[PDB]
Amino acid sequence: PEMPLTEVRKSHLAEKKELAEREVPKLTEEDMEAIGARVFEFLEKQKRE
Amino acid sequence: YKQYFDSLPLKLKSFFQRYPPSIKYSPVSTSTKAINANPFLPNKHPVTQRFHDPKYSLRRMSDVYKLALRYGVEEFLPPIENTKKLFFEEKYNKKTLMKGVLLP
Amino acid sequence: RQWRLIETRKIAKQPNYQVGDAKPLHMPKERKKFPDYKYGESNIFKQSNKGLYGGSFVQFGNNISESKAKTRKKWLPNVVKKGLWSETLNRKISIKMTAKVLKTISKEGGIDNYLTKEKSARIKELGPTGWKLRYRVLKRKDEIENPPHKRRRLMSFLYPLEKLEYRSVGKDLNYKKFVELFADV
RNA sequence: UAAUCUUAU
RNA sequence: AAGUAAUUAAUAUUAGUAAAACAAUAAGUUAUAAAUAAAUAGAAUAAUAUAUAUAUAUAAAAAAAUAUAUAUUU
RNA sequence: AAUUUAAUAUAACUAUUAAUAGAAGGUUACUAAUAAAUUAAUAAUUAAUUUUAAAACCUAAAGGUAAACCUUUAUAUUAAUAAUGUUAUGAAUAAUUAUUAAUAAUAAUAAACUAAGUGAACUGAAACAUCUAAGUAACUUAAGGAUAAGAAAUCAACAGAGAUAUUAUGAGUAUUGGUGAGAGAAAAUAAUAAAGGUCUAAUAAGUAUUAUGUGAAAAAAAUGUAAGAAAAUAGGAUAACAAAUUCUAAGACUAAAUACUAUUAAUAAGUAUAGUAAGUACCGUAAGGGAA
Ligand SMILES: [Mg+2]
Ligand SMILES: [Mg+2]
Ligand SMILES: [Mg+2]
Ligand SMILES: [Mg+2]
Ligand SMILES: [Mg+2]
Ligand SMILES: [Mg+2]
Ligand SMILES: [Mg+2]
Ligand SMILES: [Mg+2]
Ligand SMILES: [Mg+2]
Ligand SMILES: [Mg+2]
Ligand SMILES: [Mg+2]
Ligand SMILES: [Mg+2]
Ligand SMILES: [Mg+2]
Ligand SMILES: [Mg+2]
Numbered sequence: 123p124e125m126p127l128t129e130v131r132k133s134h135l136a137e138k139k140e141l142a143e144r145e146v147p148k149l150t151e152e153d154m155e156a157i158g159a160r161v162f163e164f165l166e167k168q169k170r171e
Numbered sequence: 172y173k174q175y176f177d178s179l180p181l182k183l184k185s186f187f188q189r190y191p192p193s194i195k196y197s198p199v200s201t202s203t204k205a206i207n208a209n210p211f212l213p214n215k216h217p218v219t220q221r222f223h224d225p226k227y228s229l230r231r232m233s234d235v236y237k238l239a240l241r242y243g244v245e246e247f248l249p250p251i252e253n254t255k256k257l258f259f260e261e262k263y264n265k266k267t268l269m270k271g272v273l274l275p
Numbered sequence: 276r277q278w279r280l281i282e283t284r285k286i287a288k289q290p291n292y293q294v295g296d297a298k299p300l301h302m303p304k305e306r307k308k309f310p311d312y313k314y315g316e317s318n319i320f321k322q323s324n325k326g327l328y329g330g331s332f333v334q335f336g337n338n339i340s341e342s343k344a345k346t347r348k349k350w351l352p353n354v355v356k357k358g359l360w361s362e363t364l365n366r367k368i369s370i371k372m373t374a375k376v377l378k379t380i381s382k383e384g385g386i387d388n389y390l391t392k393e394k395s396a397r398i399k400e401l402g403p404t405g406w407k408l409r410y411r412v413l414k415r416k417d418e419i420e421n422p423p424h425k426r427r428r429l430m431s432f433l434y435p436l437e438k439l440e441y442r443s444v445g446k447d448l449n450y451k452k453f454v455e456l457f458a459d460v
Numbered sequence: 461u462a463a464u465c466u467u468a469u
Numbered sequence: 470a471a472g473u474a475a476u477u478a479a480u481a482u483u484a485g486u487a488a489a490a491c492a493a494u495a496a497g498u499u500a501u502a503a504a505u506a507a508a509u510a511g512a513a514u515a516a517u518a519u520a521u522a523u524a525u526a527u528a529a530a531a532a533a534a535u536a537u538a539u540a541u542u543u
Numbered sequence: 544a545a546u547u548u549a550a551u552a553u554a555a556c557u558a559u560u561a562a563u564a565g566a567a568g569g570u571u572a573c574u575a576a577u578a579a580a581u582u583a584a585u586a587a588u589u590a591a592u593u594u595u596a597a598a599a600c601c602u603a604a605a606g607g608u609a610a611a612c613c614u615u616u617a618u619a620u621u622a623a624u625a626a627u628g629u630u631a632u633g634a635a636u637a638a639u640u641a642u643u644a645a646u647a648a649u650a651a652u653a654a655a656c657u658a659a660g661u662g663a664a665c666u667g668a669a670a671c672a673u674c675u676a677a678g679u680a681a682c683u684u685a686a687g688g689a690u691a692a693g694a695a696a697u698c699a700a701c702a703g704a705g706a707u708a709u710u711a712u713g714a715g716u717a718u719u720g721g722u723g724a725g726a727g728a729a730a731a732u733a734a735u736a737a738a739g740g741u742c743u744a745a746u747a748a749g750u751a752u753u754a755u756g757u758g759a760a761a762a763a764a765a766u767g768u769a770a771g772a773a774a775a776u777a778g779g780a781u782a783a784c785a786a787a788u789u790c791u792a793a794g795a796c797u798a799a800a801u802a803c804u805a806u807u808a809a810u811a812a813g814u815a816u817a818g819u820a821a822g823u824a825c826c827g828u829a830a831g832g833g834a835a
Binding site: 276277284315319329332337342343344349374375378382383441445449452 | 604621622623624643644645646649650658659660661662672673674683684685686687690744745747748749750751756757758764765766767768769793794795
Binding site: 128 | 308310393409413416
């Protein structure tokens with residue numbers, strides 16, 4: 123038989139559930155494009171110098 | 172641009188995926204529950220009032236920063252001000268010489 | 276500190292048994308009463324399986340003289356028999372403890388509290404006995420918190436009718452069997 | 461003497 | 470039925486390359502400078518030691534020791 | 544058409560490399576059998592995949608026992624019916640047979656490799672006592688196909704790296720030793736290697752640290768006894784202190800290169816006394832030894 127969860131463990135579980143419920147940070151296409159453009163600019167600058 | 176982004180090293184790419192640059196993360200230590208909580212800083216948990224260790228441990232953070240420096244993608248990473256690490260030319264310039272060097 | 280002599284221990288990984296699968300050759304008679312303790316049961320200082328030793332195993336080392344003539348000695352922990360009060364169980368529980376463990380108990384403010392601390396370190400330095408004690412306490416706490424309603428009679432009412440129905444078809448039906456049938460329902 | 465410990469039922 | 474093998478070090482002979490060799494991914498080992506416990510020292514100011522370098526000593530020499538120099542570096 | 548040479552077998556072991564995978568003995572008998580399906584490709588077929596029958600007794604752990612035997616009673620109850628004969632007053636009580644439903648059972652399981660516990664001595668030091676042999680042999684326990692380790696309270700040195708494992712150089716260098724016998728790193732650079740990072744923790748206290756007793760020949764992290772902190776404004780790291788630097792313990796997961804066994808393939812300046820029998824004959828009360 124599985125051992126029951128103590129108070130602290132339950133509270134931690136609840137916190138984890140709350141965290142999951144919130145909207146997750148996800149890397150957008152736009153952000154990637156912005157990064158990629160900046161990388162390209164950096165490469166161009168390196169080539170120049 | 173997308174292809175150039177993809178060509179970035181793996182660790183850096185992974186970091187960008189899981190802590191994206193749209194969110195302006197805090198310079199100072201924050202609540203662990205916060206959305207803008209910096210993964211490089213030790214954030215305090217609001218209930219227990221204990222400082223959690225940084226989500227990216229210090230070595231990993233340093234590696235990520237060096238990768239960003241290499242590919243010119245520093246400002247898209249969250250700030251490393253209040254983490255005590257400086258890097259390369261900035262570190263060289265900003266540092267005070269040791270007491271032993273200046274005053275033997 | 277570390278818990279090397281505890282967390283080194285490995286136990287045979289039991290395969291998860293599906294309801295429709297074939298039996299193992301040796302199935303036990305009486306069922307498992309307690310949960311499985313992650314770190315098994317100590318196979319060295321078996322003295323400590325019976326008590327709350329706080330992960331304090333016997334050391335072996337060297338008696339060394341003025342001549343540096345090394346001779347093997349052992350260093351036992353300061354074990355002590357101690358009947359300490361459980362608030363949850365409403366009885367005092369007598370066990371072997373290290374003096375260190377007794378000190379920790381005193382610091383934490385009770386024996387139940389010591390048992391139920393959620394940290395992994397505590398779990399490691401609980402014994403199998405300590406794990407069983409913890410389970411007993413935790414289960415009791417859960418019962419106190421949450422009584423069943425906050426069904427048996429209905430079952431008792433239906434049972435004789437069910438038996439009669441069975442008899443009318445042709446077969447006899449015993450309670451235990453009825454209980455077994457209508458556990459999940 | 462509800463520190464400890466020994467015995468008997 | 471009895472001087473064998475492995476990992477090393479020092480000599481010798483030959484063969485390859487040679488002020489370089491082995492290796493070529495870099496790194497390393499040996500050589501190319503002698504000393505000194507060690508240190509920030511180290512080889513003709515106008516030539517053979519009568520000069521120079523180092524260690525002792527010293528203002529700098531001398532003094533003991535070893536090493537370095539007389540078209541081409543060994 | 545035959546002969547020869549080289550290679551290949553159900554039919555050798557050994558070493559290496561590569562690839563793949565993690566596996567029944569005995570005893571004597573009322574002897575311990577099998578049946579099928581689907582799918583290609585040339586009705587029978589061979590091959591692949593799947594299902595299915597039987598299978599005694601012994602091999603610690605149903606209960607015994609002097610292994611291959613004995614005793615338990617699943618060709619059992621308990622109940623419900625049906626058929627039969629007897630007892631006492633259509634109904635009741637026991638027995639036998641035949642259906643239906645309900646109730647439990649079968650450890651022969653590797654060895655090597657791994658981790659943990661305890662831990663010698665001969666021996667070396669030309670003696671021997673610290674030291675060595677050596678955390679070796681051995682015994683004991685526990686796991687998995689591997690285990691262990693592993694994403695820095697790590698190294699380094701003001702420049703930097705940026706997980707663990709194995710090997711080469713570093714280097715027999717630093718280091719250490721009755722400064723004897725002898726023992727001996729790390730950084731760094733290369734390979735091998737896999738996608739190698741990633742949260743699972745409400746961020747860790749009788750914990751760090753201290754005293755003391757022990758503790759891998761150098762280099763600690765451990766540990767019995769007892770005192771015992773701090774919040775990132777902090778904490779760990781070096782005799783010590785000051786500066787600086789670096790990392791975040793007391794919560795976790797992890798392929799891969801590796802070890803061992805077996806199989807298959809290939810290569811043998813290997814074996815015919817390292818070439819298949821036999822762990823037999825025989826020796827011993829026994830553990831055990833062991834032929835031709
Ligand atoms: Mg002088
Ligand atoms: Mg048996
Ligand atoms: Mg008898
Ligand atoms: Mg061992
Ligand atoms: Mg001797
Ligand atoms: Mg003698
Ligand atoms: Mg030793
Ligand atoms: Mg593992
Ligand atoms: Mg050794
Ligand atoms: Mg922590
Ligand atoms: Mg912490
Ligand atoms: Mg100590
Ligand atoms: Mg940590
Ligand atoms: Mg692990």
